[PDB]
Amino acid sequence: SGFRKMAFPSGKVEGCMVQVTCGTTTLNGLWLDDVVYCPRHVICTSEDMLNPNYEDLLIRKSNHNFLVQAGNVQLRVIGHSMQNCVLKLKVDTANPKTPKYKFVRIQPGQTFSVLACYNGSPSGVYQCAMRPNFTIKGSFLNGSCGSVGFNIDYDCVSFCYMHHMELPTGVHAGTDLEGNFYGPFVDRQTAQAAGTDTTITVNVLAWLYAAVINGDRWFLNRFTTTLNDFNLVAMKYNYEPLTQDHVDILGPLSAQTGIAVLDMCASLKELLQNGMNGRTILGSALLEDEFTPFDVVRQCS
Amino acid sequence: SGFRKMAFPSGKVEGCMVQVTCGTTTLNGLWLDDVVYCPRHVICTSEDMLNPNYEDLLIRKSNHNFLVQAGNVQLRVIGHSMQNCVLKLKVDTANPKTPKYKFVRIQPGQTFSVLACYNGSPSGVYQCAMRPNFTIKGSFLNGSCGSVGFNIDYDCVSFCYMHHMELPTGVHAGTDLEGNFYGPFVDRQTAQAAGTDTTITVNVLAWLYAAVINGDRWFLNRFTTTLNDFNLVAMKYNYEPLTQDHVDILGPLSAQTGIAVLDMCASLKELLQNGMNGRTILGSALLEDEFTPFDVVRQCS
Ligand SMILES: *[C@H](O)[C@H](CCS(C)(=O)=O)NC(=O)[C@H](CC1CC1)NC(=O)c1cc2c(OC)cccc2[nH]1
Ligand SMILES: *[C@H](O)[C@H](CCS(C)(=O)=O)NC(=O)[C@H](CC1CC1)NC(=O)c1cc2c(OC)cccc2[nH]1
């Protein structure tokens, strides 16, 4: 038993991280086959960052202006293009460590592992959730741009995130592997606002099921409720409304524990209104919403 | 900025995990050079597990009684021996992905990354701290025995843990890579008790410094205290006594934030006596003790 925040094994992603330098700007890049993907703002000076015309700036850059390093081996750049906010550098060598991979755009509330790297060298790995306002609460220092988030299904790596910037509130922003930002953000040096964040209700319910499977107990009551009456409280505590589809995706856990979804909703309502009164759930004094139902099923079984 | 619980990149350790089967029992093994290290209880049936004489059981096992798989490649076992609670199987092939490695026995309060594997395939990675009672609060299911915990300095992997059992309280126990258990535990199928767990004070102080670095400052008071007066309060709330050496280890953080160790001890005293009054520190309602000072320095700088 046991339930901890868990990331995917990062070896398959470690095999693809490289270092990209343009002028004096150095960040990380993803090396897949004979292409290296990185943030386009690698081509910018401190002064271009205020209001950059990335098309004009990229036109002033030639292949030899990009220095790409994998370990002790430089990769000669033979082509370059721009897809949205992402720069694609075609190099002369195909990465022999290229795994079976996909480019996927995740929904808000879903989770993925982040491999924080600096100068192309992996530094750490940790689990993250896409907040409803399309930000993530990660750990990034200057030079971490190009680090990627991913999931792994058997032997296939679904890349879903590339880090670009940090917002004034301390949360982080980035794009998919096709250059499209998650949320209303742009890669300019301006203070940008994220929307109001809300709690992922289905994730809190999945986490409560995980707690029940692992022996945590005291919060379960012999009460029940309806979707309408539970939503009435969810609105009061800044929780997302609960839909019947969300009830359906909690089906496997509800069948494993033998506890109806609406019963767990009643328990959650009681926890929201009264608190915990000194107790913890899975060693936590707060209700966690960073675990999807699939994460719970994968970890506990 | 930001501060999440972070694990080391697991690729170097992924390159060493193999599957070891002895009879009907299958678990994980660590393949370094031409040796495979695993838990010895792999040679036990469900019947011997109650009170096994591992010498007698090992005597009745030959080299061919051990099946070792690295991926889809069979590793022919040419020798076998027992060192404490660890089984060493010498095979005919040396692991080409063997990293520079060390075997370390860690102190209570130090942290490391766990690579949970099943049937030789890595499943997840997460960060753990060795509790003062020599247990870890991890996530393990049946078949995870042989999974390892490690640290990485530059390019050297220091292995420090191998999982063996789960206690009745839900915590987990194991050995170092030389077979010696952490704590008073034995590898047999009995309900065993651990000592009283205490909070790692130096880790809580390092976590408070990390909070100050990332913007959280509300808990900083205009007060100071002596190590003796602080230990008086720490003894009441089940905190480990702070030593001058611990104060020295907190030196880099104290210099970076410009906040004396004793002033932060006063802040911790006030937090322990008054609570948090609804506020949070780094998005946490509890004082966290699973981050060493070096973890804080490495993550924030
Ligand atoms: C790339 O390595 C870098 C990562 C920063 S972090 C702290 O998240 O590791 N990215 C940036 O520095 C980006 C570059 C621009 C193209 C997106 N900028 C910011 O992260 C940034 C800019 C601001 C401003 O600008 C006015 C104001 C507040 C916060 C802020 N962050
Ligand atoms: C090995 O894969 C296995 C891991 C169990 S777990 C839940 O931690 O993933 N290890 C065991 O099953 C060990 C085997 C013996 C040699 C150490 N046993 C236990 O973990 C165990 C046995 C008990 C008993 O036995 C009466 C009672 C309570 C708890 C308990 N744990």
Residue numbers in the entry:
A (entry chain A), B (entry chain B): 1 to 301
Give the authors' words.
SARS-CoV-2 Mpro is a cysteine protease that acts as a symmetrical dimer and displays positive cooperativity for substrate turnover. A series of potent reversible covalent peptidomimetic aldehydes and nitriles was designed as Mpro inhibitors. The overall binding pose was similar across the four compounds and in line with what has previously been characterized by Hoffman et al. The P1 group inserts into the S1 pocket of Mpro, and the cyclopropyl moiety inserts into the S2 pocket, whereas the indole maintains its position across these analogs.
When the warhead is an aldehyde (compounds 1 and 3), the resulting secondary alcohol hydrogen bonds with the Cys145 backbone nitrogen. At P1, the installation of a methyl sulfone moiety at this position results in hydrogen bonding to the imidazole of His163 as in the case of the γ-lactam, whereas the other sulfone oxygen is hydrogen-bonded to the side-chain hydroxyl group of Ser144. Substitution of γ-lactam for a sulfone at P1 led to a 10- to 20-fold decrease in potency for the aldehydes but up to a 750-fold decrease for the nitriles (compound 5 versus 7), suggesting a greater dependence on P1 for nitrile binding.
